[PDB]
Amino acid sequence: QSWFRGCQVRAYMRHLNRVVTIIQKWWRSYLGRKFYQLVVEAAYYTMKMNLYNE
Amino acid sequence: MADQLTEEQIAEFKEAFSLFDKDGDGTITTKELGTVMRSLGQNPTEAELQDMINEVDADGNGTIDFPEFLTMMARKMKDTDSEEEIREAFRVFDKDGNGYISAAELRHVMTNLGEKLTDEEVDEMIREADIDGDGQVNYEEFVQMMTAK
Amino acid sequence: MADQLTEEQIAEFKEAFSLFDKDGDGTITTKELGTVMRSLGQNPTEAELQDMINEVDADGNGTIDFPEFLTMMARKMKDTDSEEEIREAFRVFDKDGNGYISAAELRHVMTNLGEKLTDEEVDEMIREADIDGDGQVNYEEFVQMMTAK
Amino acid sequence: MADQLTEEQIAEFKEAFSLFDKDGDGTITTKELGTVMRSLGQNPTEAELQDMINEVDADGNGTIDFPEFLTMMARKMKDTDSEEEIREAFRVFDKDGNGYISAAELRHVMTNLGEKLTDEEVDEMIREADIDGDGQVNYEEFVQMMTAK
- Look at residue D49 and tell me if it is in a domain: yes
Domains identified in chain C, total number: 2
C33 assigned to some structural domain? yes
> Is C32 marked as a binding-site residue?
yes
Contacts of B49 in chain A (CB under 8 A): 28
Cβ-contact B43, A26 below 8 angstroms: yes
Secondary element (H or E) of residue C66: helix C66-78
- Is residue C46 one of the residues assigned to a domain? yes
Q: Decide if C115 contacts C46 (C-beta within 8 A).
A: yes
Residue D1 exposure: Cα atoms within 13 Å on the Cβ side: 11
Together in a domain, B66 and B87: no
Q: Would an 8 Å CB–CB cutoff place D86 in contact with chain A? A: no
- Grouping H, G, I as helix, E, B as strand and the rest as coil, residue B101 is strand
Taking CB atoms and an 8 Å limit, are B113 and C15 in contact across chains? yes
* C-beta separation of B130 from B100 below 8 A: no
The residue from D23, D55, D79 where one domain ends is D79
Residue B108 forms part of a structural domain: yes
Residues D73 and D91 in one domain: no
Please list every residue in chain C whose beta carbon sits closer than 8 Å to the beta carbon of residue A12: 39
Which residues of C are less than 8 Å from A4 in CB distance? 125, 128-129, 142, 146
Sign of CA dihedral B70, B73, B74, B75: positive
Method used for this model? cryo-EM
Q: How close D23 gets to chain A, by Cα (Å)?
A: 32
Asked if the C-beta of A6 comes within 8 angstroms of chain C's C-beta atoms, the answer is yes
Q: Are residues C73 and C94 in the same domain?
A: no
C85 annotated binding-site participant: no
Q: Do A53 and D114 touch (CB under 8 A)?
A: yes
Of D79, D107, D128, the last residue of a domain is D79
Domain residues for D52? 6-79
Residue D51 is inside which H or E element, if any? helix D46-54
Q: C142: exposed, middle or buried (C-beta count within 10 Å: 0-12, 13-18, 19+)? A: buried
C43 appears as a binding residue in the annotation: no
Kindly state the DSSP code that residue B36 receives in the 8-state scheme: G
SS3 call for B136: strand
Please list the residues that pair with D136 across neighbouring strands: D102
Burial profile C43-55: b = 16 or more Cβ within 10 angstroms, e = fewer: bbbbebbeebbee
Is the Cβ of B42 closer than 8 Å to some Cβ of chain A? Answer: yes
Dist. CA C9–CA C29, nearest whole Å: 20
Do B125 and B90 lie in a common domain?
A: yes
B1 falls within a domain? no
Residue B112 burial (10 A CB sphere; 0-12, 13-18, 19+): buried
* Spacing of C-alpha B39 from chain mean position: 7
Last residue in a domain, options D59, D79, D99 = D79
CA distance B109 to C21: 9
Best CA proximity match to B48, nearest among B79, B85, B93, B16 = B79
Amino acid of residue B56: V
Assign residue B90 the CATH number of its domain: 1.10.238.10
Q: How many whole angstroms separate alpha carbon A37 and alpha carbon A45?
A: 12
User: Are D20 and D58 in a shared domain?
Assistant: yes
Q: Which of C19, C27, C36, C65 to mutate to test the interface with B (most CBs of B within 10 A)?
A: C19
Chain B residues whose beta carbon lies within 8 Å of the beta carbon of residue C65: none
D84 shares its domain with D52: no
Residues B102 and B113 in one domain: yes
Nearest to C107 by CA among C132, C143, C140, C134: C134
E-state strands within chain B: 27-29, 63-65, 101-102, 136-137
Closest CA to C35 of A10, B93, B106, B88: A10
Cα–Cα dist C44/C69, whole Å:
14
Q: Are residues C13 and C71 in the same domain?
A: yes
D1 found inside a domain: no
Answer for the pair C44, C29: CB distance below 8 angstroms, yes or no.
no
| Resolution of the coordinates, Å | 7.7
CB D97 within 8 A of CB D88: no
Whether residues B43 and B74 fall in one domain: yes
What secondary structure letter does DSSP report for B39?
T
Alpha-carbon span C33 to A9, nearest angstrom: 12
Do residues C11 and C60 share a domain? yes
Annotated binding residue C123: no
- Does residue B72 sit in the same domain as residue B22? yes
Q: Do residues C15 and A17 touch, judged by C-beta distance below 8 A?
A: yes
Looking at the structure, do residues B23 and B66 belong to the same domain, yes or no? yes
| Contact predicate B64/B57, CB 8 Å | yes
* Interchain contact, B19 vs A47, CB within 8 Å: yes
Distance (Å) from the alpha carbon of D116 to chain A's nearest alpha carbon: 9
Q: If phi over 0 gives left and psi between -120 and 50 gives alpha, with beta otherwise, what is residue B54?
A: alpha
Q: Are B76 and B37 in contact (CB under 8 A)?
A: yes
Residue B79 class from Cβ within 10 Å (0-12 exposed, 13-18 middle, 19+ buried)?
A: middle
In a domain, B69, yes or no: yes
Give a yes or no: residue C1 inside a domain: no
Chain B residue nearest residue C18, CA to CA: B112
